[PDB]
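Q: What would this complex look like in 3D?
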Amino acid sequence: IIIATKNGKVRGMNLTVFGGTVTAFLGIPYAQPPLGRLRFKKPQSLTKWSDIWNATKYANSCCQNIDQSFPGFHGSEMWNPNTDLSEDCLYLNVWIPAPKPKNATVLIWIYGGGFQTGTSSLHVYDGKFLARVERVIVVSMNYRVGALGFLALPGNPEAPGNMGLFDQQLALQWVQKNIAAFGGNPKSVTLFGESAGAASVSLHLLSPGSHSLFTRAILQSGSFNAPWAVTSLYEARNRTLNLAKLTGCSRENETEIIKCLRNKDPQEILLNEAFVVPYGTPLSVNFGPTVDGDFLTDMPDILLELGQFKKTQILVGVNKDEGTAFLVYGAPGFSKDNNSIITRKEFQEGLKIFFPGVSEFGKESILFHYTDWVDDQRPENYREALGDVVGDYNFICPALEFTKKFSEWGNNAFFYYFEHRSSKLPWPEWMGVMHGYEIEFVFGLPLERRDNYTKAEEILSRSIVKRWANFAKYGNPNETNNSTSWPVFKSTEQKYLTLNTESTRIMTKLRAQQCRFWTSFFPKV
Amino acid sequence: DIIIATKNGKVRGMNLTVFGGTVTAFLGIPYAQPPLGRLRFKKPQSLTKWSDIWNATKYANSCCQNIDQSFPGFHGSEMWNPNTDLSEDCLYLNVWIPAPKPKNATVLIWIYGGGFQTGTSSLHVYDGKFLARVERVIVVSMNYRVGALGFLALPGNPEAPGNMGLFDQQLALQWVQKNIAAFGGNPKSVTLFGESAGAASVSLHLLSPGSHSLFTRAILQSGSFNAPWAVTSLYEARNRTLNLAKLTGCSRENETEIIKCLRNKDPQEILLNEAFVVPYGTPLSVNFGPTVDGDFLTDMPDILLELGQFKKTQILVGVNKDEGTAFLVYGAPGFSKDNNSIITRKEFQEGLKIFFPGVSEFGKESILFHYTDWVDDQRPENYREALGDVVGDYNFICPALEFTKKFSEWGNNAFFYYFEHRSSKLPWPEWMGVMHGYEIEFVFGLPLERRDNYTKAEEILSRSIVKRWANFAKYGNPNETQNNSTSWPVFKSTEQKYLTLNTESTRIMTKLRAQQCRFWTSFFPKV
Ligand SMILES: *[C@@H]1O[C@H](CO[C@@H]2O[C@@H](C)[C@@H](O)[C@@H](O)[C@@H]2O)[C@@H](O[C@@H]2O[C@H](CO)[C@@H](O)[C@H](O)[C@H]2NC(C)=O)[C@H](O)[C@H]1NC(C)=O
Ligand SMILES: *[C@@H]1O[C@H](CO[C@H]2O[C@@H](C)[C@@H](O)[C@@H](O)[C@@H]2O)[C@@H](O[C@@H]2O[C@H](CO)[C@@H](O)[C@H](O)[C@H]2NC(C)=O)[C@H](O)[C@H]1NC(C)=O
Ligand SMILES: *[C@H]1O[C@H](COC2O[C@@H](C)[C@@H](O)[C@@H](O)[C@@H]2O)[C@@H](O[C@@H]2O[C@H](CO)[C@@H](O)[C@H](O)[C@H]2NC(C)=O)[C@H](O)[C@H]1NC(C)=O
Ligand SMILES: CN(C[C@@H]1CCCN(Cc2ccccc2)C1)S(=O)(=O)c1ccc2ccccc2c1
Ligand SMILES: CN(C[C@@H]1CCCN(Cc2ccccc2)C1)S(=O)(=O)c1ccc2ccccc2c1
Ligand SMILES: *[C@@H]1O[C@H](CO)[C@@H](O[C@@H]2O[C@H](CO)[C@@H](O)[C@H](O)[C@H]2NC(C)=O)[C@H](O)[C@H]1NC(C)=O
Ligand SMILES: *[C@@H]1O[C@H](CO)[C@@H](O[C@@H]2O[C@H](CO)[C@@H](O)[C@H](O)[C@H]2NC(C)=O)[C@H](O)[C@H]1NC(C)=O
Ligand SMILES: *[C@@H]1O[C@H](CO)[C@@H](O[C@H]2O[C@H](CO)[C@@H](O)[C@H](O)[C@H]2NC(C)=O)[C@H](O)[C@H]1NC(C)=O
Ligand SMILES: *[C@@H]1O[C@H](CO[C@@H]2O[C@@H](C)[C@@H](O)[C@@H](O)[C@@H]2O)[C@@H](O)[C@H](O)[C@H]1NC(C)=O
Ligand SMILES: *C1O[C@H](CO)[C@@H](O)[C@H](O)[C@H]1NC(C)=O
Ligand SMILES: *[C@@H]1O[C@H](CO)[C@@H](O)[C@H](O)[C@H]1NC(C)=O
Ligand SMILES: *[C@@H]1O[C@H](CO)[C@@H](O)[C@H](O)[C@H]1NC(C)=O
Ligand SMILES: *[C@@H]1O[C@H](CO)[C@@H](O)[C@H](O)[C@H]1NC(C)=O
Ligand SMILES: *[C@@H]1O[C@H](CO)[C@@H](O)[C@H](O)[C@H]1NC(C)=O
Ligand SMILES: *[C@@H]1O[C@H](CO)[C@@H](O)[C@H](O)[C@H]1NC(C)=O
Ligand SMILES: *[C@@H]1O[C@H](CO)[C@@H](O)[C@H](O)[C@H]1NC(C)=O
Ligand SMILES: *[C@H]1O[C@H](CO)[C@@H](O)[C@H](O)[C@H]1NC(C)=O
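A: Here is my prediction, written as structure tokens for the whole assembly.
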């Protein structure tokens, strides 16, 4: 079937999903290909095509380095791109219930990947189950990553920074001018994302240019106040100049540096992004969002303190073991192929890798705060402490803090704590409930019963799916009789809802004792 | 009928059956006027036009060269000898195209080695049909003049200017530019690859401005221009020209009468005297090779490299594990191919005299000292392997590593490999190991042919190297697949990472033989 968009018509596909049908448009272009003289610039709006575009296959994924630490391993390769890499990559995808709705709420997914990786066409981001089961329209877009998306020379329209954020913004504009032709409501659109996708979503809360382009926001395992999320203009200029040296592109002038960089083979940009930082860590974001004076008119924390942001409802959460995924990408003694029992010395060496610039006194204080063992017998105490150090500092504690400050402006906020470990998880049991492994429950993958999930995992996925869709439609993540009511998160009581197969409780002040260190003592070492 | 219209006339080819498919082969296409008579020792003259159909259906003549007859009937030495007739009329190229015809194929151009004194593009180990068949690339190779007929030099004299063999290669590259679209090839996707003096040739095309528009990317197997054997100083070349004139009764008062005299000599009278132009030579002597001619090379190549004056593109470089052992059975005391060549410390010292004729007694002692820190004192094999490694490190491995460092410092992606697999069909004894030149049959896919008695592990290894080489040419990155494959990382002068190639495990490693090479880069030049 065909739909006419404001720049031409596109042809879709019929998908048979759970005894019904979902109509899919995969690979709609939404911007001019950022090639040649457009490399490093903001995305240019598309002009009309006379033929009919066939949105029938997923499009090219944006240029990016590939995780090849574990050749053959599903737990790492499931995140790698599954279409061809190319600078020609500004495409989005649209999934629509059948029969065609007339004012369906739209959910727009922004993937993560540390701003360096990612693509909207991963299996775990398949929006067909969401459209089928809750009658929402699901949209996802490819946006530029690494230096091709976030190389910054502040002030210069040739390489201004945040280009990948503007990609996302141009996709949200596309939805405003086209989703009605598909049966969707441009006045009921909810952004959701994970990790850098979540951080991206929260930056759309701040940027005035994005204010009118969506309604509500969902932030899975990420926010802009996380330590990895924003590069200083200082650091970004140091890194741009380092990439210039590593590629042979050091000039005396900004515009000649980018003229030279625009002539490099993409793989000569890609394969040098790793060296622009002298002391990276497994959480390094070589090229990420900056204070560009355009997307971010100021520095996000001031915008958040002063209350200069879109006022709306938010849904925010974290997983139980955010930290463990990064331990096997650098920390000594850790492996996916053994139980990774480490000593206090190895723990001290892992703190070095994750906190390279921290004084010996500060690293001792991290150690001390995380070693008040409730059972000082357990060999795996140190292995768990290091994962909790990384997870609390990089994900959990910033998410709580963001929700506190955002709520204190008269906004309904809801917070969740995801504790279910997937029965299919390819990684070892010690990594627990990992970063990224709630996504397949949010997208409804366990509802497919020919897939080796458990029954409880189907029941859990179905409620998360329902609650997310309800928050999109109504602004409150409610479910149907025998269902826990989700209370608002408020600064004083700090109530959050737990998610797991056993019992979903309501709790207060998540990990408050851990996070007191990262907010109130660590900033002073 | 199989007919392509080239800018000099029409050519007719032949169909080949490879792995249940077809490869169109044009063998023996001329690319230059035959360098006969008054054209002896001059740069190649561009071709005119013929009206017939040229039949490009057999390999052409090999250029004149002495043959290696050290081991009559020995496949090991004789597989390198020319397999077509010898003649001064030898400037022909071959083209292998995948069937069905491609529309914009990437082109790989092979430049053979052979000490700049031997070699031919028609050898069985250089057969491009497998690569065309399996990776859908066009494969071109050319014959270029070797020995004094290719590299005799009186610098600045157009009658014998130097580097003619290199201009031959260049003229063939110009042919690919002008003509290869007609065959289905993309002139804008051209990768040069070559081995030994073919690899030193490839690296010189990166330095030579006249070559810069004739290719895209470069692959260097077991050689580069900074190797000690690869380039003669301008006046050492001019001196050898006059010794050859003297050895043939062509000494004259002016250079052009010398050349006029040499031009009337029989090719064999010239070949017969090429060995004698060097006072003392090693098994790695290049009597007549590249020199600084003021045309193809406008300075000593080490200067141009250091100053960043070379083509900025991606390179793939590597070496074999036992580069040196081949040269020990060609002059060193105690070494035979027919016994296990256990030698003594005194035989080792005589070995060094053979390969380092002009080095002081202290210099030869320091080389010995650096290479005798045994892990096990006996190990009867210690001194035998030390000598092979001395020869291998100084002539191939350490210069390839140094060229890759320096080249990569100017901002392009480089990729280094260490080839460690001994061919199961290698006719040479086991003590010689992974020899010089014995990765070539794996680069061209000869193990993919199952009727040929390779192991199946060698088919998987050759299949992988073929894929990485072709992907490098197409994409500038020698990747195999995205999943289930060791990533080949860029070679950077800090970490200096390389990929090992063998049947057991391809590993990412660092600082290949740095403890050895530090001697040759930082102590031996002070000796
Ligand atoms: C190149 O070869 C042809 C002969 O080719 C044969 O015929 C071709 C048409 C084709 O079928 C090939 O596969 C065959 O091998 C030479 O031929 C001239 O014309 C006819 C062709 O059959 C032949 O009977 C004549 O005798 C040939 N002319 C002469 C003067 O002998 C052609 O000359 C060859 N080209 C060169 C440069 O030698
Ligand atoms: C995945 O591919 C491997 C190939 O092994 C490798 O290739 C190397 C060059 C390097 O890239 C390395 O990282 C990569 O793993 C297949 O391998 C092997 O399987 C054969 C049988 O088919 C055995 O004979 C080998 O011993 C075995 N080698 C190993 C495991 O190292 C493997 O079958 C394939 N698996 C899947 C699921 O695709
Ligand atoms: C250039 O090379 C000369 C080499 O001369 C030789 O005579 C040739 C015919 C040839 O057979 C070769 O084997 C001979 O070495 C250098 O001249 C040298 O000095 C003497 C002069 O005839 C000669 O007897 C020596 O044998 C030779 N030197 C050595 C070490 O063998 C000449 O010095 C070189 N340099 C220049 C600038 O000409
Ligand atoms: C280069 N990075 C590679 C990462 C290393 C660890 C994560 N894996 C993915 C992964 C594996 C297993 C389970 C879940 C996820 C790959 S990254 O570009 O992907 C990256 C960088 C910094 C980030 C900082 C904050 C959050 C995410 C980041 C991701
Ligand atoms: C006069 N040379 C004859 C050689 C001597 C040793 C090599 N064999 C060939 C051979 C045998 C076995 C395995 C591989 C190769 C014959 S040469 O002109 O061919 C020559 C000269 C100098 C070179 C310097 C660098 C590399 C190769 C050289 C070849
Ligand atoms: C900015 O970039 C420069 C360029 O690399 C970095 O410089 C190095 O700093 C380390 C100390 O960590 C020294 O060991 C090196 O010798 C320095 N190299 C050069 C060329 O100066 C610098 O650290 C970077 N700074 C920041 C804050 O990013
Ligand atoms: C090997 O890696 C290269 C990346 O360097 C891949 O290249 C892309 O390849 C596709 C062809 O399938 C092209 O359409 C894209 O335009 C290429 N883009 C870039 C930036 O190179 C290549 O596909 C990989 N091949 C394999 C077999 O994995
Ligand atoms: C074969 O591929 C080349 C690119 O490698 C095509 O050339 C295009 O890109 C060139 C970049 O070097 C530019 O010059 C042009 O944009 C374009 N060239 C043209 C239109 O002639 C080339 O056309 C391809 N030929 C085919 C597909 O037949
Ligand atoms: C679900 O499981 C099916 C059967 O297989 C497996 O479990 C173990 C024993 C291994 O053999 C493993 O390879 C299999 O997963 C699979 O055929 C099917 O593909 C699986 N589907 C998913 C989505 O995992
Ligand atoms: C939740 O959805 C909307 C928004 O509050 C409301 O109309 C509906 O009755 C609610 N249902 C439940 C079960 O809370
Ligand atoms: C699936 O296919 C057709 C193709 O035109 C599409 O129009 C429709 O949504 C589906 N067909 C039905 C429902 O009969
Ligand atoms: C568009 O899609 C239709 C679907 O069958 C296909 O037949 C047609 O060839 C396609 N054409 C273009 C230009 O995409
Ligand atoms: C929903 O869609 C209808 C479609 O006509 C529109 O009139 C209405 O304003 C939209 N807004 C809301 C809040 O439902
Ligand atoms: C930057 O340098 C180049 C070098 O010639 C020059 O042409 C250009 O005008 C310069 N631009 C500015 C803004 O200085
Ligand atoms: C786990 O594996 C890593 C890497 O193989 C190793 O360094 C570490 O010591 C191992 N630990 C245990 C407890 O086996
Ligand atoms: C050449 O190959 C083509 C394609 O396979 C084939 O149709 C034709 O018969 C062949 N011509 C010959 C062998 O003369
Ligand atoms: C083998 O090589 C030659 C044989 O001609 C000889 O000089 C050498 O001593 C022999 N070595 C042995 C038999 O170990």
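A: To summarize the key features: The radius of gyration of chain A is 22 Å. The pocket of ligand 9 is lined by residues A 424, 451-452 (CB under 6 Å).
Q: Very helpful, thank you.
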